[PDB]
Amino acid sequence: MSDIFDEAASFRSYQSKLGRDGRASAATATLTTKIRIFVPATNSPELRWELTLFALDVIRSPSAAESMKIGAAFTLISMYSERPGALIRSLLNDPDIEAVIIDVGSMLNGIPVMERRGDKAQEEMEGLMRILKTARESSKGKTPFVDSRAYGLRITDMSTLVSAVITIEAQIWILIAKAVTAPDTAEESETRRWAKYVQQKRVNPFFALTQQWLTEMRNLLSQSLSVRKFMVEILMEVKKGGSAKGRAVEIISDIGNYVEETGMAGFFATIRFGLETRYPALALNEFQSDLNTIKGLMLLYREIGPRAPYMVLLEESIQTKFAPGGYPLLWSFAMGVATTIDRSMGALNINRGYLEPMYFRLGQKSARHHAGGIDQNMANKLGLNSDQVAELAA
Amino acid sequence: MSDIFDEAASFRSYQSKLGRDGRASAATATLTTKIRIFVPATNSPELRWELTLFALDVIRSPSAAESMKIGAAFTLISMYSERPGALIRSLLNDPDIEAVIIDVGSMLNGIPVMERRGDKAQEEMEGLMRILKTARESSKGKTPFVDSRAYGLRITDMSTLVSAVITIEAQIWILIAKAVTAPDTAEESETRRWAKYVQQKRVNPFFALTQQWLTEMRNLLSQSLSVRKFMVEILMEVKKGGSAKGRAVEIISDIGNYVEETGMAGFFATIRFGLETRYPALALNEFQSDLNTIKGLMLLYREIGPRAPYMVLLEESIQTKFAPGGYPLLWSFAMGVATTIDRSMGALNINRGYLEPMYFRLGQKSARHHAGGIDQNMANKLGLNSDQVAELAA
Amino acid sequence: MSDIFDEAASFRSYQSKLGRDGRASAATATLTTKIRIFVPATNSPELRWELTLFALDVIRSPSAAESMKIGAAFTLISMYSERPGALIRSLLNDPDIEAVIIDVGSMLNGIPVMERRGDKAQEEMEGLMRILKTARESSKGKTPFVDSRAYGLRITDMSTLVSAVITIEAQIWILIAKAVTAPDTAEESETRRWAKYVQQKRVNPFFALTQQWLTEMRNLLSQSLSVRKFMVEILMEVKKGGSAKGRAVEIISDIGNYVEETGMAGFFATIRFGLETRYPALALNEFQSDLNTIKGLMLLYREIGPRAPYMVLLEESIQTKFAPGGYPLLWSFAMGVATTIDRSMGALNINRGYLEPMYFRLGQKSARHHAGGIDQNMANKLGLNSDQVAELAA
Amino acid sequence: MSDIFDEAASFRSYQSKLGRDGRASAATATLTTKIRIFVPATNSPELRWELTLFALDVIRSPSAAESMKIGAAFTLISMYSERPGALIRSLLNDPDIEAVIIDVGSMLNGIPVMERRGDKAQEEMEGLMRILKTARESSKGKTPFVDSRAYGLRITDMSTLVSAVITIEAQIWILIAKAVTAPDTAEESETRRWAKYVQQKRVNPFFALTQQWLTEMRNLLSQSLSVRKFMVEILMEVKKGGSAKGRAVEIISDIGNYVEETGMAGFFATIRFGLETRYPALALNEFQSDLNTIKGLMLLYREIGPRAPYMVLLEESIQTKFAPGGYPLLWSFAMGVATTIDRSMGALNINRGYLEPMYFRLGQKSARHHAGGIDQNMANKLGLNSDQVAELAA
């Protein structure tokens, strides 16, 4: 009777947030791996420039261990800050790893540890020399930068270093947008992002890394979750307004605009196209279940918190509930109207196992062949009967 | 049901202001670069005239470092004030740079540091001499001013110095309007502004800088963000009324009238044309999402603060959300109606990848062929059917 | 009549806090002197030990400029902290000076500037070498430490560095107690404090500086006010409880226990002895003005704030109002009763020009020959006449 | 007038808690030293017994570094717990040190690190072998235990290990009572404490360490504050009732009864004897100041918190304010009645510089020659006039 179809509505609402309450224990604590991070101790551009040159080689090195590669990645990302050690320690929320910050101090060809020389320090120098030699020999004499003069370049002015660093930072931060969603299909939007900043003159194109190095970094960025967690944490903190933003921060925040809501196009297309833009083909006894599920997802997205846009980047388990497959019918209808309306929408890969072409066809007919679709009019257009016809004539 | 399409609206409203709350930390602190600014210590007209000539030469110089160019620009912008050091120190909000104000004191051909002569001073003296020599040799003997007599001109009267400084400041401040939006397509609106100010006799046309120097300064202004931030801060402070305004301040505010809302013609054109000028073609079930996004953008713009008009100049990350691309349909409709209505609108470059020519055609038709479009009439026009027919006859 | 003698009291109360209200302007801004501070960039024990040895040499140097000596003192005082630059920048309230923090980086025999070598660095290196040579040649080959082996000592263990640094900091901090009150009459209380800390095993006696270096450092500390202000700020910050205190902080607070209320023995002795310890000779119609002045001074001391005990160290102008001379009669009475009562009091130098020997004699008599002086008894001692007689018998 | 002597009472009360408010900053952060702690990973008695044998030798070793000695001390104290690593990490509040817990795993003659053998592990084995060889050679073949059979004893039963460990724990925990107050004058109460537990059969006397080893441990315990802080933290946590107490915990809590209020006998004797046991010789114009100061100290002691009894052990700077010297007169009177009443009181060393024998003599007369001292009688003893005489006759 009347109680039925309302008990279920509460039942489905209760089922979604079934056991996601309370606080977990410390027994389920992941084993931690030591990660050695080489941060610049001083503000001298000559040491900082030599440091970021070293961090570039470690990432490009094929003989480098993964833990060393994460250290180079953490060294690069925090290079812009005046106190990289403080930034890493105050913006790290990775239970998987423990970070041991190492102040570099001075600069040899590699890094001088300068701590009880001879005692457990000599082998580290030999290891780093092997890292540098293998990195340079691995490539065909090709420097990480697209310009061979940008590698063996002497930097002493603070102004040049800041411009040089930001270009390295910006090019790395470009990859996060499509590092885990479709890393192979990248280099098109990434080039478009780089071209945009070049025209804005925010980045000096002289310090442009080659695509060989970018592929190596992107492979590192996809494999490792700790680096992704650190960069997502930076994005959220930078997103919070209130303080003055520097040139490095403004670029990061601008890049974070493209990063948000990545990897969840199937869910958001359903919200924007299938659900909104109210079409008379919604209530058809095959979307009422999906509409109920979608309503629960909106509450779940609001309940998650500030990490909701970057769910795919952090690989949250909540993401699977958001993916199409739990509401294949409405999503199929949503992609039907999406391809017809949005020209860009159509390069999306939607060859899933629950396409349901009949509902896809209905969405295609909904955009054009269904009706003009005049919604509630606050302004009273009594003579708009022909106005719809002219609009419908197209 | 009824809850749907309102839950979704609240969801989009919450998603717009998702994580832009709270206060950030000091860990994300940009590295600062020292910027040396040469300000006049006294009010003697000859010293100030020599100082602004030196600043012009340094800006024109090709061998000048970028920091020196920024120092020269800051010296120029604050020349009108009787206390340039106080003006710079009390109107600087640039975390990227730290300004070390230097009182010039006396004046040689260059500038006498007058601080422990021989100790760390002769090198700076020879550097400034090299700067001046390279600046003079670089051009084909052409002075920065369009009149060769305006360069080697002796100034001893305060009024003449004030007039020349006002002209130089005005000619500098014309460039900010189209320095980052379309610097290449400039020199038309800039020439129009210069002609307008000449016809108003606010600027003496004798001190007119050549177009080569103007191009060099526009390139410098586009490259650097600190100068843009300082000039935007000056514009914001001058805009606040309450006190007496001098000739320099009046000219600066008149220029800032044109400066405001630059680089956001898409959003404001969308508002003014698509949103206002209520057309029966608005409520069409394909514009509701765009209207909701536009409303959220309106609240965001109100929330941003006094820096909202100058977001493109400061390169705020919030600007990307304002750009068309999140509402291409309504934007295309508004561009169509604007191009049909506003004759000047049509020189705008709108060859984007989301043009949607169908909606552009729909807007073009809605502008003219749609109907007369009589809105709510407070005055009762009983017999205005024939008036509407005659108006539609055109 | 009745109103008079109360109008006078209100008049004196208003006169005490006559013009000490409102906020001052920025026009009265002292000229600032640049002070170069060499702080350790890293946590390596060898670098910190070499840095503190260099600071000791610079302080002992006779050819050192005063600014260099202040920089060395600031380097020494902040050596215990893991981030000396942050400690100095966040605990500096000196309008007289501006501090330019310099991260040392690596360390040669002196300090490597490591910033554009050859450009304005070689002269500083030669100056530092001259400073070291003059410091070493000035004494008769006598190292700053009382043990010649403590100077040319290699430090690589963190614990040894911490112990040596704590000892040096403690020996420095002993001097502040009697640096400006009576620097010449020192070396007795200072030696007592050093012996106390040695017997407590808080300080390793191996790193004990010679008395020549201690005299030089005490002279430097008395001459300079910025160092005193910095150390008083450190004392005030450490005094505020709430957080865990390290060995250095505990030693500093224990020394500040002796530091407090220094140089104001006259006022506090007057309070404790003349005002408290109620004697029948107090209300005698020659002490009412002094009592009113003392009450006003107590109100002023409560009004001053947390800087009240260290008024002599900061050389506050309000201190002169606290000194005896505005209440010579009650002060003399209190010093008489103190010299008769307190055995230790009597080594104080009170050969002032307002001794008033009659009141000193009156206080001496009031201490012993006056009466037993039984005050208000909560317990009813009805048979205490014989007890009072026996007590007066002595 | 009446306001005077009440303004001072508030003034002295306000002066005590002058600047002890608010929260300190993190700038004053002590440099941390790494401390390596060898904890047993498993519960096997054979490994635990071999571990505590190793920790005994390290403490006895003369060639051992201080940091190693602290690690042995931390290893011993936490040996009773089933999870020594959890106990140390959850009961450590030492900002001076950082503890790196090392699970021992298996057991060779020394300790097998078992982590990448050959890589930075071989030298550690050689160092430990040097530690063991020097420790055994330093003594004249004397084992740490008073019984030579207790050293080379095989332990496989859990029951024997628990009894053996507790004896080692109890003997170490005896020293804390008089480790910093008067370490030289120890071995009398310490032997008395040990004899008491032997008669109670809580400790098996077979595992009794020689006095040569106890002196070495006590010297370590006095020098190092980190060990004292850890053991004080254990005392407070064990003091908090609510849970079941094991044999190890019960001994520690029983020992903590003697540890409490150590090193503050001068203050507490004044409270118990001078202030309490109300004598008609209190109000004499020479104790009113001391009574006021004593009252302020009681509030300060209550304000400190649970760490108030162990102020001397933690070497809190607040302790100096509690020491006699700020109230020498009443303390001298208090010790006067203390020596006459308490036979044990009189072995205390009170040869200070502020003895004031006249007030000491008055205290001596106060106990016996002053009066019987009949206080307020709730029971009405009308015929007690002769009862006092018989009591006074003695």
Author numbering:
A (entry chain E), B (entry chain D), C (entry chain k), D (entry chain j): 1 to 394
What does the paper say about this structure?
The first gene encodes the nucleoprotein (N protein) which associates with the viral genomic and antigenomic RNAs to form the helical nucleocapsid. Here, we determined the cryoEM structure of the recombinantly expressed, full-length, and tag-free HeV N protein in complex with E. coli host-derived RNA. Following cryoEM data collection, a multimeric HeV N protein double-ring assembly was resolved to 3.5 Å resolution, enabling the building and refinement of an atomic HeV N protein model.
Subsequent 3D refinement of a curated particle stack comprising 5638 particles and using D14 symmetry resulted in a 3.5 Å resolution cryoEM density map, revealing a previously uncharacterised multimeric nucleoprotein assembly. Each tetradecameric ring has a diameter of approximately 20 nm and is topped with the C-terminal arms (Ct-arms) which cover parts of the globular C terminal domains (CTDs). The double ring assembly is approximately 12.5 nm tall, and each ring has an aperture formed by the Ct-arms that is approximately 7 nm wide. The HeV N protein double-ring assembly is formed through extensive lateral interactions in each tetradecameric ring as well as intercalating interactions between two tetradecameric rings. A defining feature of this HeV N protein double-ring assembly is the gear-wheel interface between the two tetradecameric rings. This intercalation zone consists solely of residues in the NTDs of N protomers in the top ring and N protomers in the bottom ring (indicated by the lower-case n). A clear, reciprocal hydrogen-bonding interface exists between Ni and ni+1 with the residues Lys120, Glu123, and Glu124 where the two Glu residues in Ni form a tab that interacts with the Lys residue in ni+1 and vice versa.
